[PDB]
Amino acid sequence: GALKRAEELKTQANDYFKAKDYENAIKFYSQAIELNPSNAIYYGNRSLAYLRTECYGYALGDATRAIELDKKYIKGYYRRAASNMALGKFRAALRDYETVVKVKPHDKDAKMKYQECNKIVKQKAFERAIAGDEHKRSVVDSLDIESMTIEDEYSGPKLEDGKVTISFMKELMQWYKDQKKLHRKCAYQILVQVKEVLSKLSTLVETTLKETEKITVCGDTHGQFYDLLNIFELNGLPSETNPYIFNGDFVDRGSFSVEVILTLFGFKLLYPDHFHLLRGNAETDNMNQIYGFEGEVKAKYTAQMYELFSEVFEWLPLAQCINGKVLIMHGGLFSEDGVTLDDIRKIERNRQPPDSGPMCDLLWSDPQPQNGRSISKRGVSCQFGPDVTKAFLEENNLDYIIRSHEVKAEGYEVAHGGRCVTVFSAPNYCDQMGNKASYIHLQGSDLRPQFHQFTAVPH
Amino acid sequence: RIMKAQALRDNSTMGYMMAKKHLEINPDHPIVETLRQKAEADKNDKAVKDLVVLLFETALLSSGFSLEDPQTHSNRIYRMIKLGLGIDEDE
Amino acid sequence: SSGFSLEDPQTHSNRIYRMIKLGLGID
Amino acid sequence: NILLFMGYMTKDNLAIVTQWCEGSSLYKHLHV
Ligand SMILES: [Mn+2]
Ligand SMILES: [Mn+2]
């Protein structure tokens, strides 16, 4: 019978395993199984070579086979437990080890390994008990939208969790011509959906503009919708044929600012691919307080609305890159020329911007004429002339940078050795400039900033 | 504690008059020295984050400060009670 | 849970520091 | 007839004792 050579094969293979000749052990073990498909011992010792070589997939397999093949192979359960510990299968390891020890009390024991299993599972159970830190109950838990309490005092259409109809959005723009506001359940429901989409968008936005396609780019709005009312009506409504990019600064000041983000966040749901919103540099709780936006919210709504707006706002991106050739930022240049695109993808959102590092280079850098580099203040470490940008633009293959921090006479300027440009949406921004405004027009075939001149001055 | 119970007092100023908390550790103590060793073994072990928070709430309570929500606290206790009481149903 | 204070908060915390020591395996 | 329970005729004291803030001096908030 074939057992005569299976004995030699298993013997030679155990001797190869002891001699660290693992391939030869596995081959002669396989051959011993080829002569006896059902000896549980062969699958047992074969699984031990698969512990030793970390060939764990067949440690698990052949340990299971050894035990299925003989339910009374006690030392098979023991070797399965050895596989389980190597691999973290702790409950199975306890049960296998318990059985073995009660059957075989010893001094060079299975029981030190059982006590290691005991000590490990004891601490892991304690850790499962003291564990909070799955702690993220939602701002809107108990689903405040489905509490009904609908009013329609505004005669407002129902706005579903599906994309807000353009017809209402046109009506909403009319509700701003008429100083009229959304109902609360719809407003909560859009803020929930806005969170859900925005929190998944990349922290640096990447878009390819085809040669035949043109983008209109927008800057600081100071929370006045009148200017965007007009550009949407003037340059085409922000539909798929008007893939606008907005350089933030909406809660920059409060005047219609709730109403501004409330419409922008409406349009963002209907055309998310075409309509792109960045965070502005005057935008944190610190300024939401100073310019009374927090008060507008607390006047129009109970304070939990401000917690939801905080959550929603915290997901805004800082930057966008067009074709890998034009980079849109708020403030200006990075503290060093070595800043690398995947390292920008590794910037951590769900925090306030710092006064140092890439996030307040992006928001509070502030480009100069003169060559070099500034020192830490103003939400910052550094601000710049041309020289670092020559070397930065060479890393990433960029042409020039877009900024929105500073007012300029025609609504824009091309500056910084010709390697940077200005834009913003509000004409007569402040006590500080009575500027005209403009929108940059960019073609995939021609990225030299082209402009729309905006003289429609509110106030 | 006294201020929060004054029936007719204006509490809008509580954000100004409440003091900031300092935490003091006893370095000569067993739990603290073993916490040093485990925190040194791996800084980001969520178990250290769990243990530090459980120690903080206990200290807070015994120091005389109300817990922000006592149900979170009681639930941690009810989980540790199960572990010692011999519930084989972990669920 | 019910809003009562403890007559002495130390005995309560000691019961906690014992469970913590057993859970960690300190003693 | 019985020693009957008395729902006690309670009193509500709403007296006040004034509290005052040791606020920052002008010097402190201006230069420190
Ligand atoms: Mn701004
Ligand atoms: Mn600015």
Side-chain angles (χ1 to χ4, degrees):
Chain A
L3 305 177
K4 183 65 173 184
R5 182 59 186 148
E7 286 270 35
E8 297 182 344
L9 286 165
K10 189 217 67 174
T11 300
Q12 289 180 279
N14 285 338
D15 293 342
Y16 298 151
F17 164 81
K18 289 176 297 184
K20 324 305 187 297
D21 189 14
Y22 305 123
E23 174 193 321
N24 208 11
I26 293 306
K27 284 175 175 179
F28 281 57
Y29 286 148
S30 182
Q31 293 152 11
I33 293 183
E34 290 168 1
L35 295 193
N36 186 334
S38 62
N39 190 330
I41 308 304
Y42 298 1
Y43 286 88
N45 282 31
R46 190 173 190 240
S47 81
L48 305 181
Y50 294 150
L51 304 181
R52 198 60 50 79
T53 64
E54 302 181 345
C55 191
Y56 290 122
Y58 290 94
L60 289 173
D62 295 348
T64 301
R65 294 302 86 81
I67 290 163
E68 289 169 351
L69 284 168
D70 182 6
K71 77 177 183 177
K72 286 291 189 175
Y73 181 29
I74 303 298
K75 191 172 291 186
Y77 292 91
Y78 183 72
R79 55 207 55 196
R80 183 169 64 190
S83 195
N84 288 343
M85 291 303 287
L87 300 171
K89 312 301 181 186
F90 291 107
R91 284 185 173 185
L94 295 169
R95 295 187 298 249
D96 286 352
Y97 286 141
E98 270 289 6
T99 299
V100 171
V101 173
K102 73 185 186 185
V103 175
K104 300 295 184 182
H106 207 276
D107 306 277
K108 186 60 177 179
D109 55 25
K111 216 183 185 184
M112 86 185 179
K113 290 295 188 180
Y114 183 50
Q115 296 299 1
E116 297 318 313
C117 191
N118 203 16
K119 286 179 295 183
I120 294 158
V121 302
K122 281 173 176 184
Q123 288 184 329
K124 292 308 305 177
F126 176 67
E127 291 171 15
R128 291 200 310 269
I130 68 159
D133 205 42
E134 58 171 30
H135 78 84
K136 301 154 56 76
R137 52 179 302 289
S138 185
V139 180
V140 303
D141 279 345
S142 79
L143 188 55
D144 293 317
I145 297 140
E146 296 298 345
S147 74
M148 299 293 95
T149 318
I150 61 179
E151 301 170 88
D152 302 349
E153 64 176 331
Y154 316 102
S155 307
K158 71 184 182 182
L159 301 188
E160 194 154 315
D161 196 29
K163 293 176 175 172
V164 55
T165 175
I166 190 64
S167 68
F168 183 76
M169 290 191 283
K170 289 178 179 179
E171 182 169 3
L172 185 57
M173 290 175 71
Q174 182 177 357
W175 289 16
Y176 306 163
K177 298 173 182 177
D178 295 329
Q179 192 53 292
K180 179 176 176 181
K181 191 185 65 65
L182 193 59
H183 187 268
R184 284 186 70 173
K185 293 331 184 186
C186 303
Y188 277 121
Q189 182 60 97
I190 64 177
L191 287 163
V192 164
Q193 186 56 242
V194 174
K195 189 202 74 174
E196 276 292 346
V197 301
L198 183 60
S199 69
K200 298 186 183 82
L201 180 65
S202 176
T203 307
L204 167 63
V205 182
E206 181 182 36
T207 51
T208 296
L209 182 64
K210 288 182 288 282
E211 293 83 1
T212 61
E213 286 295 342
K214 181 183 276 186
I215 279 171
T216 301
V217 188
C218 170
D220 295 20
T221 78
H222 75 65
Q224 171 57 278
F225 189 60
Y226 181 77
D227 291 336
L228 288 191
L229 186 153
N230 283 334
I231 205 65
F232 292 165
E233 292 177 353
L234 293 169
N235 283 4
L237 293 176
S239 74
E240 68 275 14
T241 59
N242 300 297
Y244 285 94
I245 309 169
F246 309 78
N247 206 350
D249 271 323
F250 312 143
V251 61
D252 189 324
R253 296 203 307 264
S255 187
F256 299 79
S257 178
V258 176
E259 304 72 13
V260 159
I261 70 176
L262 191 78
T263 177
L264 294 169
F265 288 173
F267 285 124
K268 185 60 180 168
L269 298 177
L270 190 60
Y271 307 102
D273 300 292
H274 306 291
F275 190 89
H276 295 293
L277 302 170
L278 304 182
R279 203 182 307 225
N281 71 11
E283 307 198 297
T284 66
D285 284 318
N286 306 288
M287 287 290 172
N288 304 355
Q289 288 150 12
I290 288 162
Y291 290 102
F293 174 94
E294 185 181 296
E296 276 277 315
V297 175
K298 288 175 176 181
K300 285 168 173 169
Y301 309 105
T302 308
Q304 283 71 9
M305 200 81 168
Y306 189 79
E307 304 306 332
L308 180 58
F309 279 120
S310 173
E311 178 61 30
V312 166
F313 169 73
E314 285 319 321
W315 304 105
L316 287 169
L318 302 195
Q320 180 154 359
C321 61
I322 297 169
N323 211 13
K325 285 175 61 67
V326 173
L327 179 69
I328 300 146
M329 304 197 288
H330 202 292
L333 275 289
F334 295 102
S335 185
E336 291 93 5
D337 50 16
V339 173
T340 293
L341 299 178
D342 189 56
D343 204 24
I344 308 177
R345 302 197 302 184
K346 290 177 300 205
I347 297 170
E348 178 165 18
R349 193 158 54 166
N350 197 16
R351 303 180 297 145
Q352 295 300 316
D355 68 344
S356 66
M359 292 181 77
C360 287
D361 299 345
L362 280 162
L363 293 187
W364 286 100
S365 184
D366 181 358
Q368 297 179 290
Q370 73 267 46
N371 290 43
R373 165 183 288 99
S374 86
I375 299 295
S376 312
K377 190 169 65 179
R378 190 147 62 86
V380 163
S381 194
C382 307
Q383 311 140 251
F384 295 90
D387 275 347
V388 308
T389 199
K390 296 169 183 169
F392 174 67
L393 301 174
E394 287 163 11
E395 300 309 328
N396 50 35
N397 313 313
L398 292 173
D399 295 358
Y400 68 89
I401 286 159
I402 299 168
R403 73 180 190 238
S404 187
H405 182 54
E406 170 65 327
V407 293
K408 294 187 181 267
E410 295 176 299
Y412 68 97
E413 180 170 49
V414 175
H416 200 90
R419 310 310 294 266
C420 189
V421 67
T422 316
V423 66
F424 49 97
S425 168
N428 296 30
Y429 178 75
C430 202
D431 306 337
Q432 188 66 16
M433 212 178 180
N435 63 298
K436 302 181 180 180
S438 292
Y439 299 73
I440 309 160
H441 293 262
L442 297 179
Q443 296 177 263
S445 67
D446 185 350
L447 297 173
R448 194 287 187 188
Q450 302 170 13
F451 294 88
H452 173 279
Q453 299 305 148
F454 190 96
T455 61
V457 173
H459 310 297
Chain B
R1 199 184 89 258
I2 289 174
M3 290 290 152
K4 290 177 178 177
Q6 302 216 317
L8 298 174
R9 206 194 83 92
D10 183 336
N11 64 344
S12 66
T13 194
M14 295 288 296
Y16 209 100
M17 297 307 296
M18 289 190 297
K20 294 181 180 178
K21 299 176 180 71
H22 295 42
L23 189 144
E24 300 196 345
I25 68 179
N26 179 3
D28 298 333
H29 196 79
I31 296 173
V32 183
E33 189 164 35
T34 49
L35 171 65
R36 176 187 181 269
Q37 299 301 345
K38 187 171 168 66
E40 284 267 298
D42 188 345
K43 190 181 175 188
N44 295 296
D45 184 354
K46 194 176 178 185
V48 174
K49 191 170 184 178
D50 301 327
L51 173 60
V52 165
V53 172
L54 174 63
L55 285 172
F56 174 82
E57 291 183 3
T58 300
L60 183 64
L61 181 60
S62 74
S63 296
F65 301 83
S66 297
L67 297 171
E68 310 95 321
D69 183 346
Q71 299 308 317
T72 297
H73 186 77
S74 72
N75 287 338
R76 287 199 185 89
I77 292 168
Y78 300 138
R79 288 196 291 271
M80 293 187 287
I81 283 177
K82 287 171 174 175
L83 181 57
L85 185 58
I87 312 305
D88 288 355
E89 293 179 336
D90 180 71
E91 56 184 28
Chain C
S1 180
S2 294
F4 293 89
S5 66
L6 292 161
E7 175 178 321
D8 184 356
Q10 287 295 315
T11 64
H12 178 60
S13 68
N14 287 338
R15 290 179 186 276
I16 309 308
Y17 298 135
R18 288 196 298 112
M19 289 189 284
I20 285 173
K21 286 202 292 166
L22 291 170
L24 291 171
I26 287 161
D27 290 340
Chain D
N1 290 31
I2 70 166
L3 193 64
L4 181 66
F5 79 95
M6 171 181 168
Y8 174 69
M9 297 295 158
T10 47
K11 166 70 180 180
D12 292 302
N13 182 293
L14 294 169
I16 300 175
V17 173
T18 47
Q19 174 60 38
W20 306 295
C21 174
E22 287 183 17
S24 297
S25 70
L26 293 174
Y27 180 87
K28 182 177 180 180
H29 78 70
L30 186 61
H31 302 288
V32 177

